[PDB]
């Protein structure tokens, strides 16, 4: 469920190893 | 799977987004329900 892990992370970022860099920049976009 | 009666301690706690370790939802229904609840809490 790694795709489900990415979904459950991504839908929880905006709602509250370069993929982690895209996640932290997307958290900046979220805020 | 310890979400028997302690759902209140996560539910009203995530209204305020207090960064407090309460419970990690292991069910997909609970995660979708939290995605409804916290998004309502943001506009609230």
Q: DSSP string spanning B1-44? A: ---SSTHHHHHTTTTTT---------SHHHHHHHHHHHHHHHH-
CA–CA distance, A5 with B37 (Å, rounded to integer): 20
Q: Which residue has the tokens 């997909």?
A: B28
Q: Which pair of structure tokens corresponds to residue B39?
A: 């998004």
| Determination technique used | cryo-EM
Q: Which pair of structure tokens corresponds to residue B15?
A: 């209204």
Nearest Cα to Cα of residue B24 among B10, B38, B41: B10
Per-residue burial over A19-28, b if 16 or more Cβ lie within 10 Å, else e, is eeeebeeeee
CB contact under 8 A, B35 and A8: no
Within 8 A of A8 by CB-CB distance, chain B residues are 31
Angle at B3 between CA A11 and CA B38, to 5 degrees: 35
Q: Are B38 and B14 in contact (CB under 8 A)?
A: yes
Q: Which residue has the tokens 């305020």?
A: B16
Nearest CA in chain B to A8: B31
Determine which of A6, A15, A30 to mutate to test the interface with B (most B C-beta atoms within 10 Å): A15
Quick one: resolution in A? Answer: 5.4
Residue B38 C-alpha, separation from nearest chain A C-alpha, in angstroms:
7
What phi and psi, each to the nearest 5 degrees, are found at residue A28? -60, -45
């Amino acid at each position: 469920l790694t795709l489900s892990s990415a979904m459950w992370f991504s839908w929880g970022v905006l709602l509250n190893f370069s993929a982690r860099i895209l996640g932290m920049v997307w958290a900046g976009f979220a805020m | 799977s310890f979400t028997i009666g302690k759902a209140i301690w996560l539910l009203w706690g995530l209204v305020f987004n207090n960064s407090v370790p309460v419970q990690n939802p292991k069910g997909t229904t609970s995660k979708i329900m939290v995605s409804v609840w916290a998004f309502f809490a943001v506009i609230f």
